Each structure stands twice: as structure tokens, then as C-alpha cells.
């Protein structure tokens, strides 16, 4: 749901999100908004944090993601909430 004119926008992750991106094989200091979203998804998928029956539910209270996002869990259906949680851990270039 990122507009096309914003998918390539460069962003500078803060340390805690930078740690998370690195754990799934990222090696950059600077990312596009779309890359940040993909790697976050791969981190959730590689750690199997989503509920197997109701796959929009992500459990993260025992995980680095929950300290980063500041919630014990969240629903992927809540897009505006997730963007706010990501933008809190980013620095967008203007």
C-alpha cells in the first residue's frame, strides 16, 4: 500500500531495526521503503512468528520485534498501525 512514487524513497533505519534487518542477511545502512518491508516480512516468516491458523496474527512478545514495535502482538490487517510502528524506527530522506 506504499504509493509507487514512495516505494523507492530512501530511509535510514535506527539501530534496533538495523539489527533486525541484518539478521535476515541484509548488509546495507540505507534502504528503500519497499526493501524494509520485504525484510521485515522475511524475518517474520523465517522466525515463524505468525499464527498458523489465523495468519494475520503475529506474536512477538518474546522477540526483538515486540521491543522494536512496542506491542506484544499485532494484526497484519492493521496497515496504518504497522506503518506508524515502522516510521518510528526509520528516518525518511526528504
Amino acid at each position: 500500500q506504499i504509493p509507487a512514487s514512495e516505494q523507492e524513497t530512501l530511509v535510514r533505519p535506527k539501530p534496533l531495526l538495523l539489527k533486525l534487518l541484518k539478521s535476515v542477511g541484509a548488509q546495507k545502512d540505507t534502504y528503500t521503503m519497499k526493501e524494509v518491508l520485504f525484510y521485515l516480512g522475511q524475518y517474520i516468516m523465517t522466525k515463524r512468528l505468525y499464527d498458523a491458523a489465523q495468519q494475520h496474527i503475529v506474536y512477538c512478545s518474546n522477540d526483538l520485534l515486540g521491543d522494536l514495535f512496542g506491542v506484544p502482538s499485532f494484526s497484519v490487517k492493521e496497515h496504518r498501525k504497522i506503518y506508524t510502528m515502522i516510521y518510528r524506527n526509520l528516518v525518511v530522506v526528504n
Partner: peptide, 16 residues
């Protein structure tokens, strides 16, 4: 879905 608006019910389609 978070990236480009893709629809679906599995985690991957919902995250996309």
C-alpha cells in the same frame, strides 16, 4: 499487501 496492495489470507499475501 503492506507493500503494493496485494490481497489474500495467507501471511505472505497479507504482508505483501
Amino acid at each position: 499487501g503492506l507493500i503494493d496492495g496485494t490481497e489474500g489470507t495467507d501471511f505472505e499475501s497479507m504482508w505483501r
